[PDB]
Amino acid sequence: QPPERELSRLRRLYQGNLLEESGPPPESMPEMPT
Amino acid sequence: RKKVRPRLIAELARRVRALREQRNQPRDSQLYALDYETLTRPHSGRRLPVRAWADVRRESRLLQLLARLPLFGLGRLVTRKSWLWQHDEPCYWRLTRVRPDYTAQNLDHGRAWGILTFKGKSEDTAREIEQVMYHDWRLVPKHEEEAFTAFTAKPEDRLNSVPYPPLLRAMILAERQKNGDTSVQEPLLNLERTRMRPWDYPAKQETKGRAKGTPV
Amino acid sequence: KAYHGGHLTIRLALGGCTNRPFYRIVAAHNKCPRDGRFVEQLGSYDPLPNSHGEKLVALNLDRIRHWIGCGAHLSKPMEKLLGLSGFFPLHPMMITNAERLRRRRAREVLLASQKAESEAKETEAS
Amino acid sequence: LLSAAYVDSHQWEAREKEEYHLADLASLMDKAYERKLPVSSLSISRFVDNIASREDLDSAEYYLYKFRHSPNCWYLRDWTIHSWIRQCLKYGAQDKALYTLVNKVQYGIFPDNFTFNLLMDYFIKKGNYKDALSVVFEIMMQEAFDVPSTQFLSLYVLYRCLAEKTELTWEEERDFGASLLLSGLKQRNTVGLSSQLYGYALLGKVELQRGVRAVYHGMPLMWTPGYLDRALQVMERVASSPEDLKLGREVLDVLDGVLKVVTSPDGSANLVEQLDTEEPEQSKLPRYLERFQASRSKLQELNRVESESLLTLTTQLVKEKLPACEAEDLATYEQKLREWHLERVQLIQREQEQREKAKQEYQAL
Numbered sequence: 001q002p003p004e005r006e007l008s009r010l011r012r013l014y015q016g017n018l019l020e021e022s023g024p025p026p027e028s029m030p031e032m033p034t
Numbered sequence: 035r036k037k038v039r040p041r042l043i044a045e046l047a048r049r050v051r052a053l054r055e056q057r058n059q060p061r062d063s064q065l066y067a068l069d070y071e072t073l074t075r076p077h078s079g080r081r082l083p084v085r086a087w088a089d090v091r092r093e094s095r096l097l098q099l100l101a102r103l104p105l106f107g108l109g110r111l112v113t114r115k116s117w118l119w120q121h122d123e124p125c126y127w128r129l130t131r132v133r134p135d136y137t138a139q140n141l142d143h144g145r146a147w148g149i150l151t152f153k154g155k156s157e158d159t160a161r162e163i164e165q166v167m168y169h170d171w172r173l174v175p176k177h178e179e180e181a182f183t184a185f186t187a188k189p190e191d192r193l194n195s196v197p198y199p200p201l202l203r204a205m206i207l208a209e210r211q212k213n214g215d216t217s218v219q220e221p222l223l224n225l226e227r228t229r230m231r232p233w234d235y236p237a238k239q240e241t242k243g244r245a246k247g248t249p250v
Numbered sequence: 251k252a253y254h255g256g257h258l259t260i261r262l263a264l265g266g267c268t269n270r271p272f273y274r275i276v277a278a279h280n281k282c283p284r285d286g287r288f289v290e291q292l293g294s295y296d297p298l299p300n301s302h303g304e305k306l307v308a309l310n311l312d313r314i315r316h317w318i319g320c321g322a323h324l325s326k327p328m329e330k331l332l333g334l335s336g337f338f339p340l341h342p343m344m345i346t347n348a349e350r351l352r353r354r355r356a357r358e359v360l361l362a363s364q365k366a367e368s369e370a371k372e373t374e375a376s
Numbered sequence: 377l378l379s380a381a382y383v384d385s386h387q388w389e390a391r392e393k394e395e396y397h398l399a400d401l402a403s404l405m406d407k408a409y410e411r412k413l414p415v416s417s418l419s420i421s422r423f424v425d426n427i428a429s430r431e432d433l434d435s436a437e438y439y440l441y442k443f444r445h446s447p448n449c450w451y452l453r454d455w456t457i458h459s460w461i462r463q464c465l466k467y468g469a470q471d472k473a474l475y476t477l478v479n480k481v482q483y484g485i486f487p488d489n490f491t492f493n494l495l496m497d498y499f500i501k502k503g504n505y506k507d508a509l510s511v512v513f514e515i516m517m518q519e520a521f522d523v524p525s526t527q528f529l530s531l532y533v534l535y536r537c538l539a540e541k542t543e544l545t546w547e548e549e550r551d552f553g554a555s556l557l558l559s560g561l562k563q564r565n566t567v568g569l570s571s572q573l574y575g576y577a578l579l580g581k582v583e584l585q586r587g588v589r590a591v592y593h594g595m596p597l598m599w600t601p602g603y604l605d606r607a608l609q610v611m612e613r614v615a616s617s618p619e620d621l622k623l624g625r626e627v628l629d630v631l632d633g634v635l636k637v638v639t640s641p642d643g644s645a646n647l648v649e650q651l652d653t654e655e656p657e658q659s660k661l662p663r664y665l666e667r668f669q670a671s672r673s674k675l676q677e678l679n680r681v682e683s684e685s686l687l688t689l690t691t692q693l694v695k696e697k698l699p700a701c702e703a704e705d706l707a708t709y710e711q712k713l714r715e716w717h718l719e720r721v722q723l724i725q726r727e728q729e730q731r732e733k734a735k736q737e738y739q740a741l
């Protein structure tokens with residue numbers, strides 16, 4: 001997980017062209033829905 | 035052979051073309067002029083990238099700051115807004131020489147030299163400064179130099195050695211057993227010799243190219 | 251052709267027929283055509299599973315190390331192959347793409363569960 | 377404020393100067409620019425030295441402009457710049473001196489602290505405190521408050537103008553704020569510490585009303601937000617200082633007014649320059665107002681407030697200390713004149729040698 005100060009530094013650099021923040025990915029591959 | 039005839043016109047053209055280039059070399063005031071309404075360079079009609087538009091209107095060029103200072107600000111410190119935003123540690127140039135473009139009617143284009151201090155670490159020799167025509171420079175006030183330049187280095191925490199890749203580690207250990215060297219030491223890569231500079235680290239201006247003098 | 255400038259690179263040269271791709275790993279000057287003049291062939295890559303279900307990669311690891319020691323660059327597809335083998339570390343985008351796929355399948359599973367819950371509401375309505 | 381001895385021009389007028397007709401020298405420089413050839417610093421020096429009339433100044437102003445926009449602009453000599461201001465004062469062309477000084481980027485006139493005092497004092501004696509203020513702002517833009525004499529004169533002009541000016545525009549607040557702060561920092565007296573708190577207050581006003589970029593853009597000031605925090609620090613330092621230091625009452629009222637006004641108000645250059653984690657200055661105003669009252673109570677409790685007006689305190693400081701500075705500055709002025717005389721002789725000698733060699737080169741050719 002990036003440091004919170006580092007996430008804010010990027011939100012300032014790319015202000016106005018940002019995407020929703022992504023958290024930690026799932027620990028394993030989610031089983032394919034069938 | 036001996037039927038390969040000489041080509042006088044080709045030799046004449048090469049020399050003549052080269053001579054004209056030296057005579058009609060463009061100046062910094064012309065190559066780097068800008069139209070702020072359209073953010074397009076008249077010399078070539080190149081439009082600046084979108085991510086540079088805000089700073090071109092909001093920030094100053096280096097020699098715009100230095101033209102207002104006695105001796106063109108020799109000895110003064112200058113930093114860049116990009117560095118201020120990206121790096122917490124002090125990043126600046128200590129100006130040593132400055133060659134303004136006399137042709138410019140405001141002496142706002144030229145070349146500069148200085149000593150780099152990037153992320154708190156200072157180089158030992160002065161070299162030419164790159165990206166002098168960028169709208170990114172901020173002059174440091176004299177009264178704020180002491181607080182600005184104050185830096186205390188932290189002990190380096192980036193690993194100095196790492197494991198070998200899984201296959202390359204097995205090939206090393208296999209060679210040990212074949213050659214009779216018996217040991218359980220883990221092969222380790224040394225990263226100290228090959229440590230990379232930051233991507234925004236200043237580059238060598240002396241070896242950089244300059245744009246040609248043919249208008250578009 | 252008589253090239254001026256460029257560097258040696260290790261890349262995949264596409265061979266085979268239509269719908270039957272096959273690659274030759276080669277060391278070649280970067281400016282040369284994809285399937286043209288090369289310096290050395292360093293292996294082959296067959297991207298189609300064989301009878302045993304195996305995609306077969308051949309790497310001349312002795313010659314590959316020689317050309318990397320002489321300045322040879324690596325193409326991004328070749329960096330991925332060396333990472334899968336274990337000769338190089340896994341490429342940053344191999345890891346990121348695997349994470350993106352994990353986050354995208356989690357959404358699909360969640361949406362299916364929500365649809366099943368919506369279907370359960372339909373079952374409750376009867 | 378300065379004595380007649382400080383502004384006497386007997387020493388400058390007694391300098392050894394070469395006699396060159398301006399017309400002849402004018403032709404030499406004109407040919408060089410036509411041929412795109414560099415002009416000597418000694419040449420432009422000879423022109424300014426031999427100015428003999430009001431009309432000659434206008435021609436020299438044109439040639440100073442041409443020299444600035446030439447390959448050897450950097451080599452403009454200090455004595456040449458000082459003589460220009462001396463000639464401007466001599467023939468009544470003070471407006472021209474201020475014009476060239478304000479348009480430094482075009483003419484290249486960067487005077488030393490002694491020269492600044494000569495021009496600034498002329499306006500002060502004549503009562504033209506609008507032109508004198510311009511000289512002070514130019515000194516601030518160049519960050520040239522090194523000599524103590526300049527600091528005293530600059531603070532006297534600033535406080536006298538501020539008293540008359542009840543209404544201040546945001547540009548005026550910024551210019552006055554910077555000038556007071558930089559001049560005040562040099563001085564450790566009560567007037568100096570009062571000017572620091574006065575300057576931070578004015579700049580803090582512009583920071584919370586128009587943004588921090590209005591303060592630092594094109595100004596010799598820092599870009600880190602929190603100018604009102606710097607103002608409060610001056611109060612906390614004086615209150616807690618073991619040594620007895622006092623802050624004028626007038627400044628404390630100004631800071632109180634600024635805090636109240638900001639607290640209860642009634643193309644693509646639009647960027648958020650501060651990190652999201654850092655608290656905005658506006659949100660911190662409630663805490664700032666509590667610190668002010670606590671510091672004011674401690675200062676008044678310790679009797680560290682000076683009822684006397686800042687203009688009256690500065691006037692006493694100038695009278696007490698300025699006489700001593702004049703003697704020191706005048707001694708350095710004589711040393712500079714001798715240094716300039718020796719350097720000028722070296723340039724003249726070097727020119728003679730190259731010309732003699734030029735004859736030998738043609739003889740060989």
Ligand SMILES: [Mg+2]
Pocket residue numbers: none
């Ligand atoms: Mg780049």
